[PDB]
Amino acid sequence: EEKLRRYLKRTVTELDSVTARLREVEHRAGEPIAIVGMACRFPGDVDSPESFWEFVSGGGDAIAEAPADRGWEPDPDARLGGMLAAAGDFDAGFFGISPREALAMDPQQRIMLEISWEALERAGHDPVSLRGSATGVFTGVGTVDYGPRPDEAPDEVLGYVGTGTASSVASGRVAYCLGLEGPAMTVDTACSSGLTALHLAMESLRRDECGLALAGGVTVMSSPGAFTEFRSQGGLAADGRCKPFSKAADGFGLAEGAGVLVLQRLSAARREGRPVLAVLRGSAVNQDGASNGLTAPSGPAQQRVIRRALENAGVRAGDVDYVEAHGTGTRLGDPIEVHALLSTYGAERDPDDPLWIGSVKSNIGHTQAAAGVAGVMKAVLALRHGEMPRTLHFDEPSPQIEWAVSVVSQARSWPAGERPRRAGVSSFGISGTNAHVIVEEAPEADGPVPLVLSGRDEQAMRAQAGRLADHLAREPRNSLRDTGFTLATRRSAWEHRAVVVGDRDEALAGLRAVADGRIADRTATGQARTRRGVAMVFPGQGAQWQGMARDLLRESQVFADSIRDCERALAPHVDWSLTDLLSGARPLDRVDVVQPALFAVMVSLAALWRSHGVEPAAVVGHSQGEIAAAHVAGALTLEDAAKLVAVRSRVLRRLGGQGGMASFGLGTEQAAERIGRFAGALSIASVNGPRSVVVAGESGPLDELIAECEAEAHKARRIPVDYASHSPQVESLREELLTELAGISPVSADVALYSTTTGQPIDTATMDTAYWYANLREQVRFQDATRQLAEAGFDAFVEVSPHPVLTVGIEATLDSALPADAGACVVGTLRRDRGGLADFHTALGEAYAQGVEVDWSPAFADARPVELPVYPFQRQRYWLPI
Amino acid sequence: EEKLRRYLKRTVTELDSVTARLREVEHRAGEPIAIVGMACRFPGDVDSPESFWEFVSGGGDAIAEAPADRGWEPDPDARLGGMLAAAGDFDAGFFGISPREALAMDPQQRIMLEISWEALERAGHDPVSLRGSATGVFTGVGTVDYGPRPDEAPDEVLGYVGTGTASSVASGRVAYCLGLEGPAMTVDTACSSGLTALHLAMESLRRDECGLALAGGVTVMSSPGAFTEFRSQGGLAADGRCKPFSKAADGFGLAEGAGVLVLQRLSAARREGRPVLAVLRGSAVNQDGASNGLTAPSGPAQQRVIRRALENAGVRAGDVDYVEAHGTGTRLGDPIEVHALLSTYGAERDPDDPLWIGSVKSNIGHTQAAAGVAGVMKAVLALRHGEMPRTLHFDEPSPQIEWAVSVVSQARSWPAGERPRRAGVSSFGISGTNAHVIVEEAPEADGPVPLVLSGRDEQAMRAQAGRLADHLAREPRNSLRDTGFTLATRRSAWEHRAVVVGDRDEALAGLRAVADGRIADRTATGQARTRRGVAMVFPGQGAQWQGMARDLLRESQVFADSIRDCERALAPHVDWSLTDLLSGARPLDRVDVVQPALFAVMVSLAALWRSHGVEPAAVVGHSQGEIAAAHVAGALTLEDAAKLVAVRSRVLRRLGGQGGMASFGLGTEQAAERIGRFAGALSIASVNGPRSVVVAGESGPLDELIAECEAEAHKARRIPVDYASHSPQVESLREELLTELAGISPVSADVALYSTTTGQPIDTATMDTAYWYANLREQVRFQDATRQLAEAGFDAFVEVSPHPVLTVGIEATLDSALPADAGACVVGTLRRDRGGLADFHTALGEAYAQGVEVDWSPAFADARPVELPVYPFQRQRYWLPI
């Protein structure tokens, strides 16, 4: 029996895998598609969705004279229509395109690139992240009229003539530049092209040809062909203006434009937390077929497509509150359109609550292949702003139309009620191919910060900064933390970089300064280069200051836990509290106190760096700093290393009052000759750069040296220290160190370690007690180790200290070694009186600004994304006439 | 308990049925698409699948110097490629296109219209029947380079310049002309437009967007632009010739061409019983994305697109025996394709049995946006003839390719084994968009005659007949009956029509005659007009011959059954078998035998006419003929009409040997004056036409008249008859007639009836015994009734008799009456000694040939469709240079 209950179990589990399977399929097959980003270029200086909505709800009329710049033949009868302010302007370099090829490029190809990039940004992607993805591209292109014919083109531009004007390339070139690998195609269906495209993408996503899709359309009138052809037979308003459904309809008005939508499976966008601007729910495409003429509309067909659309959307006619009509202001067409609406959407109505109707063609003109994409944007923007804008140029309603179904003449309201709101959008093509799609409102959702920003060039970076300032200012509801998070995780990191750190008041001013070419406190600025090989430097004396990370101790957890781990390890070997010591901001005179403290702080600073994704490919230490570098490398346990520095320093107390040390701005030879005269009383303690050396020995013999030097313009800094290491005075302590350092467990390490003691880079199992005596006795030789790393192809040096002290030496050593103005950089961590996170973020910012890979995320826990301005294209005009 | 027992019983049942539904949704979703017809226009004078194959397996090289006639600027280096014989030739009239519009039309549009028609004809449709259907149009168009610009176009062709070159219109114009209502769009993917289109079409079908779809692509190089662009960049073979995969590869060879497929859901085409040529099993489209360069192909993507295509087909790489590689002979591209095939298909084979590879581009060149339609056609054809044709120009295999997977270099053969054979066909776009599709062999399928045919002009009709004769002569496996059926039910009925009746040998000879402008027996030829009103004419004496219907009684059930029904109605009134009378070919001397049989024959012939969908709108009788007419028009039951004619004829025996009748060739008044001298001894019995009358009276006085005419040369024909009806001698009969014709029950009739007794049209309830005596006593006046039908706009007179006796008179009347040469046709039925079904079909033919609606179906019982020649287009050259 029991087996034939567990037999039920798995038999029921098959049966369940299958039912939910069938739903999945069927659900997927009609799944709503989310419009997740947009971007446009319309008449009226429209370059954003924000601008489009301003222009339209504002009741803008864009119709005007055709620009002079195109090299059009003059005409007695001025050419009126909806033109694009800067149709020939393009940032070619951004896209890897030579000036020569950009010149042979159909403006329609160019614009598409720009806006495709913009739209993915607004969708929440760093578009570079999408290279190699299966993203689709579906573009509606009607006419191309840009080039001269191959047969009369300048020889300069001949390679790029065909490819630069071929309709297929409007699609493909987007795929080739953003490295997309889904299907890419250009669709021609005249006016409805734009929706044909959109429909094709929806179906592509529903079948899984891709996860993501770019659906758009473009028309740019490079020549006055259309004017000529329409001024031939009838159709153009003398006004240049579209008066949809009015008494006063003359004919349509020619225009140009471009629009894109990032489309994604609704469920997929929810899972990834992308913003849903609106949902497309179903669409349909048909032909009017046997009409009265090739270019005649046919209402019966228009009706048929409204129904197929609604069948597909799974929506009822009466549920749609508004329609974005074709509405071209034609004498034949407007009536036909309205009658087809009346007997579809209107049949299912009260008089008491009619269908509402508009046309953006009253604002921007007949934008042709883009018209439709133009209509879907208006519809989306209307669903997001709760308002139906004015349809311009409405005399009286047209007396050719037999009027459920009204036109919106004064701007109306459209608020979120019980039902979702939806809109239909239609565009009907001159060649007979009609399209209608159904749009729904989006369904329901829900200290200091480093702001990181980039430009392909220096001016772009500065534009980036200014627009971020404007955005932040005109939008105090936006979290600073989400703004930084988005900037860090969802924007491309270009060559010229800036990092502005601080709270909101500071974040604003830092950005405005970056914009105006100035630098505010805590800003990092640089040019990135690929960096492979982070060497962490670990210095010794001269890196302490009375505060030392009082603030960082409070403001960072990674740092404070590291420290805790230290106070625990040094507990046995030392009798004072690390924390009381740092938190208190207590004096740091004693050797037996300073050195282990510096050890903890520097190890703790290393932990922070690693938590922000910066890992050492090698480590170099300096005197005491080799203990930290040894631990960080992995050659020592914290317990070992802690004991080591605690013991070293306890013993070193024995030399107290018997010598001093001082740094001098000269070379080993210079110093070697000068010092030779005191036979043995002084020794060179370290050589840190071609013109920097420490000398150690008996004070008096030292003072004569310090005195003599200042009297000849030599750098000669007392180190505030009462002993003299790296000198023959250390033979006294040889016994005691070998005695109670014994029991140390060195291990070969993951990371390279370039010994200063030895002079070579080493297997770190070498570092027995015998080694550690030598580190205190023998001369340091940091200059030597620097060169070895330089020569070994390290390009990034991070001086992991509370104050930079070897930084300057290092750069001088790299002047003398690396190919001048090729590469390597040097970067510190904290600085005197500059502890606390913000200043660590500024040190990250410097490393990052020069091309170190940093993981910024730890500075933004939680932190959803947020909508930011778009890349500021550095444009130039390219235009080839006829 | 058995509780759980019951539940395993349930669960299994729902497991099973849930899996049936899931199975059925998933099948539908990706069901095989059938290629059910195809047409084309390729280099080497290829204009049909058959001529394509002949060309290709003959190892044909179409490469040649471009035609001089396109207005191309001559050039020092001659332009070699695959050029379309006559790209400028179009039948504009067939499609209702003006010469002015045709001139400004891109030839890519024109060629598409023609072959879309041809393809539908081959798929076994009358394209006309598809008007208003949901058939979609998907068309690969790359470049369009035809016109001058609207700036510089002759003002003569100006209103048609934009429409004539719009890419979208290649798709749309087809749907406009054929009246198709599916989604119609154009696609630009450069060289893979072809397959892309077919892929979109495959999916539209699978989404039930349409039931049928035309998928194709075109390129016509109207200008030398491409030659110009590629002679700057490198890449063209100096040869003109693609040598795919050979050491000899210089570059590709520009070419042009055009191809369509009629696609349909496989289940549906089986359901509709339609030739499945091959089957599209699966496809894919992708982008090679971040390649080396826009135009550079990329192996990884080529492999990806193959594997996606295979997945969708549900086919293993191992299961595919041939691939139509893109193979354009490019030095860079060829190796990349062969490597990508090697690691997809050639991974899954042991060397022993490799994948075979070819490229038609070696025969016809790189046919650009049509290439790949060209490819799928070669594969479909190869599957059908079981042969892999030779890939030309194969010097040696390329030493740059790293050779599972071999190039077919000598014509291998491909037999239908235990596996279904399949092919892949790839084509790769210069903008980086790739397609691959998978094609499977077609699955398991299993007297004299009237041939009808037509053309929009006379030349087309004759050409149509020539093509039929050839087709019938060359392919004897196609039944004549099936051929007749297809012509009648699957071909449009154009203005100029011919009908040929015969067994096969005589159908050939008649067909060949019509083709030569000659005539044969059982061959009718006409110009059709819509004819509003068939008037059936029923004559009297003269129409009989001794055979009458013996043949037709055996060959026609509709007829034999009607004769059976009469025999039954006459039996009470007459003591001789109608059947034995007609079957035994027995003499018809006596009045009481003739008149009833002639009625029974004439009434059953009417039945035939009606069984082929010819209804009288009006009828006319001539003496006894009125009886038939009255019954046919449904004023008298068969039982009444039978009684009437039996009695009327029996009583008429009383005048035997007392007079006579004879038809004279002269008009009423000419007869009247010539006859009046025998005061009353002769009567004008009937006036039938303006120069034909019948005279009844006392023989003697009648012999004098006849003698007096043969003296002066008048048509003077003795009617082989004992008596003199329609004369005073009929008073003797009045009483007996009225006495036993009483009881007759006439009623108002459905159909009109233009009484020859009265002189008018009538209410047929009128036709009581008083009327019927008048019908015998009175002058007939057929001419007055003829004109009354003319004057009331009947245009089609059918003489429903066994021998045409009134036919010539009617025609002399309608000269007078109707506008001289506005239309009218006068048709007989059978002829003396030409009874028999086939002669009836010939009568039907003369009526069909002139525009009477005939329903031919009854001639073919058990007839299946059969493939036939396509419309012979009547073409002119239209070409606008630059």
Ligand SMILES: [Cl-]
């Ligand atoms: Cl200090």
